Design a protein around this ligand. Structure first.
Ligand SMILES: NC(=O)C1=CN([C@@H]2O[C@H](COP(=O)(O)OP(=O)(O)OC[C@H]3O[C@@H](n4cnc5c(N)ncnc54)[C@H](OP(=O)(O)O)[C@@H]3O)[C@@H](O)[C@H]2O)C=CC1
Ligand SMILES: NC(=O)C1=CN([C@@H]2O[C@H](COP(=O)(O)OP(=O)(O)OC[C@H]3O[C@@H](n4cnc5c(N)ncnc54)[C@H](OP(=O)(O)O)[C@@H]3O)[C@@H](O)[C@H]2O)C=CC1
Ligand SMILES: CC(C)[C@H]1SC(Nc2ccccc2F)=NC1=O
Ligand SMILES: CC(C)[C@H]1SC(Nc2ccccc2F)=NC1=O
Lengths: 259, 255
């Protein structure tokens, strides 16, 4: 299966956390591919700037809806409003995360709960709401995760917990859809440190390492969802990408596929 | 391992009105440890404490309540500490009731699983850390194969167990760097012979259930030895494949 830019054109896609960083870049890449896009985040203005830019890039359609993913009601309403704005949905890209900084964990349960709600729970709510439209178009769901969602890393405990949660939930669902013959693909993207403006401000001091370009990253995530791959791995270190996979788990799940 | 290690240690066991938690309480009792057990069933906790005294526990008390209530969770540990005069080991074992079903739209079960199976464990840990640091204690987190590998019919449950791994494994990293001498043991359990589990998987999961009595003992031992991870499954193949050598290498390299 070879990826082609043509694959995306009459495709209707949603991109959360697209006002900046990787989400923003994906919006542009999709626009350059001339697809319908509905970007969301909290900041209304910065979102207007990305939409206009998308149209200039050739976006077949570019809209936005501002709101906070801390409120599950907005999460639901968004998928509906975004759906009618483009008359369908063929790909759901969950990319948003709550503001996260690097710190030792002490007693901030508030941040832990907020992380689980925004980084994990809303992805589930968003999925439930978009599944129907996705089943209709045999869509695809792309869940943006991190290396800290596959391995343990100090200073990002709450963040790591939410990303690990995504793997457990969405990987389990993937198996359910397989037997329930549900034609919706789920792509888990495991990313390493990326040169995002937010990432840089929070990384200088703890995560001492090379940061991959956000533009390439955003494209790799998109191509993975298009090829309907179960997982995408993108990091600046080839030695990390070499050890990040876990064949034992794949084998064990095969041996278990024979409930 | 030496049973003398627990000879008179102060231990908290959650979800101990039945199943694995109950067996752990009894093992601790026969070892002469001080034990405080919790769950929602007052009537049942009364019975476990009674048996614990019978088995030879240095001391045994219970405090009933639901871990869906974070305030109760926080206050429970402080009162448990007052009951034994401190704390040496915190065993987080409880989980919200979970049956096997495909995931449709039961957002309630997903959130409740995250709240009870994961968030309450964090609240409990935050409240017990002061006392655990005083005695260079240990935290024992009970998980499952479904917390290391994906499995259908238990999406919400699996999500919460994976979360425990990410959170507690990250904290362990911080503690070694921060000089926090409190061990964290994650227990990866295969199917266990508990009453609720045996009835929940009836006619669905076809695997040999390991004995809860032996399971409870290994969790204790692993906690006493301050082992980062305990793997317990009746199958030799599952025990081997459940490990992640790539992750251990990658992490050692990072640290
Ligand atoms: N950058 C990196 O190094 C890495 C990033 N990742 C993953 O990439 C994805 C994007 O990360 P990145 O581009 O760096 O993040 P950014 O901070 O640059 O962008 C985050 C987006 O989420 C939105 N957002 C924040 N809080 C809320 C709510 N509440 C609702 N939307 C919210 C922001 O908009 P607004 O504030 O206006 O609401 C913004 O558009 C995440 O899922 C992350 O975990 C993974 C590995 C590394
Ligand atoms: N049994 C198995 O096959 C396996 C078990 N495990 C793990 O082992 C641990 C023990 O499981 P198991 O012994 O089978 O479970 P049980 O159902 O036998 O016991 C669960 C305990 O949790 C308590 N509990 C339930 N809801 C709440 C709240 N809300 C508060 N306490 C609550 C119950 O008491 P009460 O109702 O009175 O509140 C009871 O003491 C769990 O962490 C589980 O995920 C892992 C793999 C397999
Ligand atoms: C937390 C933030 C600075 C960045 S860094 C990240 N994930 C990540 C990647 C590499 C190493 C450790 C990590 F945790 N995800 C993010 O959003
Ligand atoms: C969910 C419940 C019936 C039991 S079963 C379990 N873990 C587990 C073990 C083996 C296979 C699938 C699983 F999910 N953990 C539990 O507490």
């Amino acid at each position: 299966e070879e990826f082609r830019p043509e694959m995306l054109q009459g495709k209707k896609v949603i991109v959360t956390g697209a006002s900046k960083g990787i989400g923003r870049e994906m919006a542009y890449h999709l626009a350059k591919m001339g697809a319908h896009v509905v970007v969301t985040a909290r900041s209304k203005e910065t979102l207007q700037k990305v939409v206009s830019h998308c149209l200039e890039l050739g976006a077949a359609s570019a809209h936005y809806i501002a709101g906070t993913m801390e409120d599950m009601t907005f999460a639901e309403q968004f998928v509906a409003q975004a759906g009618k704005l483009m008359g369908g949905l063929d790909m759901l890209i969950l990319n948003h995360i709550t503001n996260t900084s690097l710190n030792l964990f002490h007693d901030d349960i508030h941040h832990v709960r907020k992380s689980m709600e925004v980084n994990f729970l809303s992805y589930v709510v968003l999925t439930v709401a978009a599944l129907p439209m996705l089943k209709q178009s045999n869509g695809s769901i792309v869940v943006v995760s991190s290396l800290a969602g596959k391995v343990a890393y100090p200073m990002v405990a709450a963040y790591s917990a939410s990303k690990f949660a995504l793997d457990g939930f969405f990987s389990s669902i993937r198996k359910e859809y397989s037997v329930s013959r549900v034609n919706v693909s789920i792509t888990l993207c495991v990313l390493g440190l990326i040169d995002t403006e937010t990432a840089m401000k929070a990384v200088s001091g703890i995560v001492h390492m090379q940061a991959a370009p956000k533009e390439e990253c955003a494209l790799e995530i998109i191509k993975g969802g298009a090829l309907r791959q179960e997982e995408v791995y993108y990091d600046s270190s080839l030695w990390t990408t070499l050890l990040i996979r876990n064949p034992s788990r794949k084998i064990l799940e095969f041996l278990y596929s024979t409930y």
